[PDB]
């Protein structure tokens, strides 16, 4: 169970990294919505990670 929990936590971290790259892309593309979505996703994931 601990290993499974760790894997889930690891997956969340990986997702956050992908989101960060997307946020950088949004700045280059000048799209407000893409940047906003990534930030929101990072926050919920962080909360989820803390719970985990």
């Amino acid at each position: 169970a601990q290993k499974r929990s760790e894997k889930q936590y690891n997956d969340a971290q990986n997702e956050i990294n992908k989101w960060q790259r997307n946020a950088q892309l949004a700045l280059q593309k000048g799209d407000e919505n893409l940047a906003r979505q990534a930030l929101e996703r990072k926050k919920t994931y962080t909360d989820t990670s803390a719970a985990l």
Partner: peptide, 11 residues
């Protein structure tokens, strides 16, 4: 968040 985005927008 919007305020933070504005700073990001310049870049």
């Amino acid at each position: 968040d919007e305020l933070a985005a504005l700073k990001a927008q310049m870049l």
